Amino acid sequence: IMIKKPQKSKPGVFSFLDPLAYEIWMCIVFAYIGVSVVLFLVSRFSPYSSESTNEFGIFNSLWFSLGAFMQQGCDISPRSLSGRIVGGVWWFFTLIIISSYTANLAAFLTVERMVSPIESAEDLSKQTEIAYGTLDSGSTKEFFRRSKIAVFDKMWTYMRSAEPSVFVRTTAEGVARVRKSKGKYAYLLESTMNEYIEQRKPCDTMKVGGNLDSKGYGIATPKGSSLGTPVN
Amino acid sequence: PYVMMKKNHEMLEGNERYEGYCVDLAAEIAKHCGFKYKLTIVGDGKYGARDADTKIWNGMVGELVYGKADIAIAPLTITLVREEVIDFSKPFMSLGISIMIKKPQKSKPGVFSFLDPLAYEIWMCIVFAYIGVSVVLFLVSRFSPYQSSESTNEFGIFNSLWFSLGAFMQQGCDISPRSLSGRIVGGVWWFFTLIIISSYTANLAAFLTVERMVSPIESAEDLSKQTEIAYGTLDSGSTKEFFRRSKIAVFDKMWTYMRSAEPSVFVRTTAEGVARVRKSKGKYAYLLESTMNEYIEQRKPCDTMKVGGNLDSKGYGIATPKGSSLGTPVNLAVLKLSEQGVLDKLKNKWWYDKGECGAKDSGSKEKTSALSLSNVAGVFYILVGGLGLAMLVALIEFCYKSRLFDRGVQMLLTTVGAFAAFSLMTIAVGTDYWLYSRGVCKTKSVSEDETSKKNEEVMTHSGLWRTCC
Amino acid sequence: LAVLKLSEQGVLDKLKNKWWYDKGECGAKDSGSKEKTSALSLSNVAGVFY
Amino acid sequence: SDSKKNSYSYGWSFYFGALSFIIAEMVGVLAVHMFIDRHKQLTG
Amino acid sequence: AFSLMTIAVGTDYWLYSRGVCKTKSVSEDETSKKNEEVMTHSGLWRTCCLEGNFKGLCKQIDHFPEDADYEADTAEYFLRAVRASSIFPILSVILLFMGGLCIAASEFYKTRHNIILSAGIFFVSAGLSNIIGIIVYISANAGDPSKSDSKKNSYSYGWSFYFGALSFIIAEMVGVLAVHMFIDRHKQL
Numbered sequence: 001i002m003i004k005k006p007q008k009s010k011p012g013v014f015s016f017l018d019p020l021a022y023e024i025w026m027c028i029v030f031a032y033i034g035v036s037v038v039l040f041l042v043s044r045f046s047p048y049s050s051e052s053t054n055e056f057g058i059f060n061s062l063w064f065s066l067g068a069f070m071q072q073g074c075d076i077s078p079r080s081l082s083g084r085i086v087g088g089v090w091w092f093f094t095l096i097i098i099s100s101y102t103a104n105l106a107a108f109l110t111v112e113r114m115v116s117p118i119e120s121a122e123d124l125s126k127q128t129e130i131a132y133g134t135l136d137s138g139s140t141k142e143f144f145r146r147s148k149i150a151v152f153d154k155m156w157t158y159m160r161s162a163e164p165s166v167f168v169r170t171t172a173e174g175v176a177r178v179r180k181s182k183g184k185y186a187y188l189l190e191s192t193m194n195e196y197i198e199q200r201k202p203c204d205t206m207k208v209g210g211n212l213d214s215k216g217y218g219i220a221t222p223k224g225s226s227l228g229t230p231v232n
Numbered sequence: 233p234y235v236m237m238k239k240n241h242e243m244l245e246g247n248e249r250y251e252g253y254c255v256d257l258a259a260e261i262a263k264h265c266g267f268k269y270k271l272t273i274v275g276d277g278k279y280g281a282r283d284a285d286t287k288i289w290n291g292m293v294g295e296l297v298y299g300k301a302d303i304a305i306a307p308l309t310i311t312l313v314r315e316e317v318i319d320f321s322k323p324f325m326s327l328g329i330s331i332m333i334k335k336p337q338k339s340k341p342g343v344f345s346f347l348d349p350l351a352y353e354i355w356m357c358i359v360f361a362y363i364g365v366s367v368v369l370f371l372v373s374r375f376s377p378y379q380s381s382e383s384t385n386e387f388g389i390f391n392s393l394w395f396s397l398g399a400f401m402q403q404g405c406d407i408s409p410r411s412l413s414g415r416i417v418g419g420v421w422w423f424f425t426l427i428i429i430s431s432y433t434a435n436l437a438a439f440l441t442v443e444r445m446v447s448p449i450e451s452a453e454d455l456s457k458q459t460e461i462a463y464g465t466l467d468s469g470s471t472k473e474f475f476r477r478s479k480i481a482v483f484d485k486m487w488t489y490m491r492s493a494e495p496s497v498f499v500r501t502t503a504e505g506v507a508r509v510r511k512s513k514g515k516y517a518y519l520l521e522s523t524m525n526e527y528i529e530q531r532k533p534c535d536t537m538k539v540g541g542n543l544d545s546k547g548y549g550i551a552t553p554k555g556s557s558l559g560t561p562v563n564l565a566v567l568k569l570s571e572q573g574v575l576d577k578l579k580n581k582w583w584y585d586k587g588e589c590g591a592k593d594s595g596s597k598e599k600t601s602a603l604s605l606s607n608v609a610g611v612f613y614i615l616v617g618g619l620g621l622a623m624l625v626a627l628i629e630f631c632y633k634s635r636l637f638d639r640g641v642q643m644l645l646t647t648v649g650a651f652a653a654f655s656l657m658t659i660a661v662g663t664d665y666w667l668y669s670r671g672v673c674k675t676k677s678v679s680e681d682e683t684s685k686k687n688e689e690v691m692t693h694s695g696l697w698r699t700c701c
Numbered sequence: 702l703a704v705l706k707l708s709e710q711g712v713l714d715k716l717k718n719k720w721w722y723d724k725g726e727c728g729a730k731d732s733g734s735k736e737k738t739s740a741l742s743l744s745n746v747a748g749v750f751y
Numbered sequence: 752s753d754s755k756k757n758s759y760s761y762g763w764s765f766y767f768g769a770l771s772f773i774i775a776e777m778v779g780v781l782a783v784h785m786f787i788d789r790h791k792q793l794t795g
Numbered sequence: 796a797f798s799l800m801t802i803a804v805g806t807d808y809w810l811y812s813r814g815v816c817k818t819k820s821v822s823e824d825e826t827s828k829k830n831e832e833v834m835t836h837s838g839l840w841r842t843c844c845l846e847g848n849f850k851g852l853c854k855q856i857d858h859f860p861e862d863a864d865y866e867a868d869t870a871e872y873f874l875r876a877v878r879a880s881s882i883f884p885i886l887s888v889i890l891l892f893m894g895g896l897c898i899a900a901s902e903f904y905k906t907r908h909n910i911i912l913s914a915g916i917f918f919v920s921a922g923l924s925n926i927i928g929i930i931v932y933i934s935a936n937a938g939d940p941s942k943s944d945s946k947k948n949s950y951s952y953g954w955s956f957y958f959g960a961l962s963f964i965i966a967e968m969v970g971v972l973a974v975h976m977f978i979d980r981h982k983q984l
């Protein structure tokens with residue numbers, strides 16, 4: 001089975017910023033600014049010296065809130081009751097978001113490196129998304145026709161009743177249909193032909209599954225030719 | 233899948249125009265009984281039923297009875313009134329009356345989906361444990377040291393809430409207990425919050441992205457409970473005759489609604505019934521054969537979902553006229569195909585190979601995507617609400633400074649609470665309305681006497697001591 | 702004809718589920734499959750509370 | 752099923768036991784403040 | 796800050812996506828399909844479609860679409876209805892207007908000693924109403940995204956969304972400076 005190789009995804013330089021979305025990282029910075037000023041506004045409020053009872057200035061408030069988010073913590077801790085409320089909820093904000101980061105970053109490290117949407121010929125039979133075709137007047141077309149294996153008979157039934165026709169004139173036209181179908185088409189061809197196409201550029205074809213059967217290429221003579229036995 | 237037109241049917245003539253499960257089965261019946269057959273569609277298009285007060289069978293059964301046709305290999309369900317007029321073979325396929333509903337869109341996780349990885353009873357116990365540890369830490373520290381000698385340690389009731397909340401949220405707190413058995417309170421609570429948070433953060437990304445099907449109606453009992461979603465069945469069918477002659481109380485509630493429905497819920501064909509399900513935006517339900525229902529579901533656009541299970545078991549049978557001579561070899565033929573797995577093979581071939589949709593072929597949907605702001609928005613909502621609440625309390629507190637319970641007043645407060653705490657506890661141990669659940673009811677005390685089965689397991693206001701219906 | 706009359710009235714279904722399940726002696730009496738993602742139970746973390 | 756086979760739902764008796772917990776810890780907190788007050792009066 | 800927020804609410808360049816264009820005016824027509832969904836500079840209230848003949852001309856979006864085959868639940872109805880009447884952005888407009896009026900009132904009327912605080916309260920609260928305006932806007936647009944789940948649409952944000960974001964940041968800093976003025980007036984007192 002030859003299919004279009006799935007696009008090789010590139011991990012970005014900032015791939016660590018991927019588990020949360022761009023709108024989330026923007027709103028976290030918006031939440032970081034918004035909490036710090038409110039903590040500043042409550043703490044450096046009217047006193048009734050008493051104004052300087054707190055150490056939570058606006059530069060100190062930004063530093064405490066960054067310490068809370070990064071889970072490291074800071075020395076200053078809010079002492080007034082309304083100052084504790086804003087410090088408490090921002091802690092509750094941090095616990096959910098940072099854990100959602102670490103759990104998704106676990107998920108982005110436990111990604112299965114899947115390159116096979118479809119696999120060996122049973123999975124080809126069980127799907128309708130990707131069409132599969134063969135070269136006309138060829139042994140591969142002949143093999144699926146006179147077949148008794150249950151999966152192969154199912155594959156031949158779909159190839160007969162397919163619109164548009166999956167059958168191709170040559171292997172090169174069969175390869176070209178695979179490349180321009182952006183991974184929605186599969187083409188069934190020989191293992192050594194699949195090897196040579198995969199080696200050559202643009203190397204966008206990937207051999208998938210295993211050999212369905214074993215066959216051979218042999219030197220052919222007409223029956224009753226005198227040269228048949230010396231060639232053999 | 234029983235009878236259908238080929239892609240090239242307009243050119244083709246005779247038997248090749250029709251193909252399908254029953255068509256190939258008609259080929260297998262003809263070979264084993266050695267006859268020649270002609271495939272004809274009945275002109276009316278019905279499945280066969282008695283007419284109302286005319287006593288004429290209309291459709292397929294009427295085609296058999298009035299001498300028009302020699303055999304009916306078709307989806308004809310074996311029923312009592314059909315058996316009386318004409319013979320049936322042994323059933324070639326088994327089925328059930330089943331419910332069809334529009335496939336609901338996958339529900340998004342809610343606003344409060346963050347508190348989902350722990351259950352409701354756990355979060356309540358955490359809050360109760362949070363209140364508990366803070367009070368104990370207050371009692372241990374401020375307890376008559378042997379003036380401000382009491383006030384040397386900084387653990388008041390309001391600070392002890394802050395230290396415990398700091399320990400739970402995994403944030404460093406300014407204060408530390410600085411006392412044996414104060415440090416024991418802190419250390420055990422540290423071990424508490426280590427395990428509880430680790431259980432919380434173990435799978436939080438999975439819960440915030442899981443998509444759950446709502447499943448409005450499970451089976452016929454839930455279907456009867458509301459008139460919001462209408463339901464109907466095919467006209468002149470075994471399903472209509474089944475609900476008509478039904479004496480089961482749930483099915484009795486069905487047939488009353490079937491007759492007294494405006495506009496008429498009955499559809500002349502299944503294809504109109506499926507089209508009515510799709511275009512009614514989930515306000516219509518369709519009661520149909522399970523074999524047809526599984527076939528409609530397995531093919532695209534796959535916007536229909538079968539719910540629950542078969543209401544009853546019945547069977548499709550090849551039908552012959554009463555007393556005919558062809559039928560007894562057809563009885564022989566159906567038995568032979570069942571033993572030779574041909575009936576096994578034909579059903580497995582037609583349904584499974586012609587699966588042409590996403591739902592049947594690869595039902596599983598796998599994705600490992602980034603979180604989006606719709607997934608986590610309640611925490612942003614609570615934070616902005618917490619910020620607004622904090623400014624409000626500070627403005628109120630500024631009013632209080634701009635403008636103390638006495639000991640006798642405080643003594644009044646603890647006596648009201650002590651009377652309340654004793655009264656509420658003794659009621660709770662005494663009364664028996666702790667839990668509402670389906671439970672062992674009391675038509676008879678045991679559940680084993682002549683199929684009691686708790687008499688349909690009614691809702692039961694269970695108690696700590698004993699259960700009560 | 703009588704087998705059909707019993708089946709259509711739900712009698713054969715009522716006889717069937719009664720004899721197997723109700724006279725059966727197993728404690729579970731039914732089974733179901735959990736979702737791959739489900740919330741924790743209090744019994745699963747009761748040791749921490751103790 | 753997903754909490755629906757029995758649909759276990761707690762009642763006012765269960766909630767009153769939860770309310771009995773909240774009142775009992777508060778009157779415990781109220782009592783200790785009285786004893787701290789008494790020891791403070793005894794010291795002075 | 797009052798200028799930037801009022802511009803952002805009024806203009807229609809919030810979001811860039813393949814959206815409903817004017818080939819279907821109210822989206823009830825036959826076979827038209829919005830010319831296969833051409834690029835639309837969608838706004839908070841408007842859906843004007845660019846790269847087309849009807850460039851800059853549109854009809855208001857209805858935030859509760861029919862024929863989308865849904866039944867609104869409590870959570871679904873609440874998020875749509877807030878975004879439909881867009882109260883959280885326009886509250887950020889009105890609160891920032893009230894605080895800016897108090898700033899003008901603060902320079903005259905000496906010895907009041909609380910008005911400069913109140914404008915600082917309005918300025919920080921206008922910012923908080925702005926953030927919940929943004930979060931409602933993003934979470935609503937996640938509903939009915941595209942053929943892919945919030946990916947094929949590629950809903951890039953226009954300068955109007957960035958101005959309301961910039962409106963938030965400067966309103967907070969002015970809210971910080973109002974508190975610094977209020978503290979400094981108490982130290983003089």
Ligand SMILES: NS(=O)(=O)c1cc2c(cc1Cl)N[C@H]([C@H]1C[C@H]3C=C[C@@H]1C3)NS2(=O)=O
Nearest residue numbers: 322323324325326547566567570575576579
């Ligand atoms: N699975 S199915 O519905 O396709 C199906 C249904 C049935 C099958 C075989 C299959 Cl494969 N055989 C039985 C047959 C065995 C004996 C009892 C009834 C007939 C004779 N009929 S059935 O119960 O109607």
Ligand SMILES: NS(=O)(=O)c1cc2c(cc1Cl)N[C@H]([C@H]1C[C@H]3C=C[C@@H]1C3)NS2(=O)=O
Nearest residue numbers: 310311323326545546547705708713714717
């Ligand atoms: N509940 S069950 O599956 O044991 C069951 C199975 C069957 C029942 C009745 C019950 Cl209760 N009756 C049907 C009957 C209805 C008509 C079709 C087949 C016979 C005549 N046979 S069945 O399909 O074999």
Ligand SMILES: N[C@@H](CCC(=O)O)C(=O)O
Nearest residue numbers: 135136137138139140141
């Ligand atoms: N080996 C094959 C190649 C062509 C094909 O696969 O159809 C043949 O000679 O027929």
Ligand SMILES: N[C@@H](CCC(=O)O)C(=O)O
Nearest residue numbers: 279307308309469470471
């Ligand atoms: N196949 C069914 C169709 C009618 C129905 O479902 O009631 C029959 O002929 O009995």
